[PDB]
């Protein structure tokens, strides 16, 4: 399909006081890769990220249109944006192209700007919000990612075990996929700092 033209996989997972997000690195046309450094996670303010997956045109397009509206929001108001507010902003942007829609499915992960409360949600290609408490996944290899997260997730997890759970969930599911791989980058954020790690994956 159109979603299966470039591949991709974006996973977010909620911890105790922290939240993690991960994606792949492979860029390519239907069977031919091009490069292994394609960015799919974009920072939108501190302690709040967003992940995009789907058609590689609309990944780079929506991430610039959302950045266009975020900077105009953070100057009319001196405050930063709440994680509930960004979800309503993205759902407005996708619904305006109701019949000309962008081919992507966003994943938003981040903390509260005042408290430590994490937040995860995902949207459809026309803007249906869906908040959860454990994990959200998006991309081509979605069914493999449900099989790993339903068995490995624990409710209250330190940033040590949360990193090890989302690592084994991404490696074992994307290696089952054919059009996704070539490296996995993992962002794990918290109240005090932001940690970014890359994993040793199969490069075939």
């Amino acid at each position: 399909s159109i979603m299966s033209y470039n591949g991709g996989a974006v996973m977010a997972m909620k911890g105790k006081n922290c939240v993690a997000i991960a994606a792949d690195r492979r860029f390519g046309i239907q069977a031919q890769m091009v490069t292994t450094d394609f960015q799919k996670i974009f920072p939108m303010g501190d302690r709040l990220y967003i992940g995009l997956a789907g058609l590689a045109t609309d990944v780079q397009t929506v991430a610039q249109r959302l950045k266009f509206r975020l900077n105009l929001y953070e100057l009319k108001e001196g405050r930063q944006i709440k994680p509930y507010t960004l979800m309503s902003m993205v759902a407005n942007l996708l619904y305006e192209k109701r019949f000309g829609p962008y081919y992507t499915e966003p994943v938003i992960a981040g903390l509260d700007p005042k408290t430590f409360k994490p937040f995860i949600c995902s949207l459809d290609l026309i803007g249906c919000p869906m908040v959860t408490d454990d994990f959200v996944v998006s991309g081509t290899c979605a069914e493999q990612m449900y099989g790993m997260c339903e068995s490995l997730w624990e409710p209250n997890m330190d940033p040590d075990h949360l990193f090890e759970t989302i690592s084994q969930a991404m490696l074992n599911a994307v290696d089952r996929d054919a059009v996704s791989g070539m490296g996995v980058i993992v962002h794990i954020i918290e109240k005090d700092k932001i940690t970014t790690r890359t994993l040793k994956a199969r490069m075939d």
Binding site: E77, K82, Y84, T85, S88, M89, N92
Partner: peptide
């Protein structure tokens, strides 16, 4: 309708 949040008074 855009932000799904009651508008602040400074806005």
């Amino acid at each position: 309708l855009v932000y799904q949040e009651p508008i602040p008074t400074a806005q």
